[PDB]
């Protein structure tokens, strides 16, 4: 019924490893850029 069975699961593997590796990196990159807004501080200084 599914001759591909094997190759398809060998693929599923490579997929997770890469997927894991890549999602990690991209999370860092996303965090790294947003860091500028995340840390960011602000004050209201009317000229009272």
């Amino acid at each position: 019924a599914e001759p591909e069975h094997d190759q398809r699961k060998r693929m599923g593997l490579k997929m997770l490893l890469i997927s894991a590796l890549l999602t990690s990196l991209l999370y860092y990159m996303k965090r790294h850029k947003w860091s500028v807004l995340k840390s960011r501080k602000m004050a209201y200084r009317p000229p009272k």
Partner: protein, 61 residues
């Protein structure tokens, strides 16, 4: 310090950065494939044709 070396050498000049990514992808592939197949196969000892193959490959009829 590798990070600095890597920075100045590879990552600083946007042109070498891309060059690194290319050669880097090349090496990464070759190895990531080998290791994964190796993991997959090992995980399935004697179940693959690659394994049982010898029993009929030049040893019959």
């Amino acid at each position: 310090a590798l990070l600095r070396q890597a920075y100045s050498a590879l990552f600083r000049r946007t042109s070498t950065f891309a060059l690194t990514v290319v050669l880097g992808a090349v090496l990464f592939e070759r190895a990531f494939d080998q290791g994964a197949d190796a993991i997959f196969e090992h995980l399935n000892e004697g179940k693959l044709w690659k394994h049982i193959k010898h029993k009929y490959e030049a040893s019959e009829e």
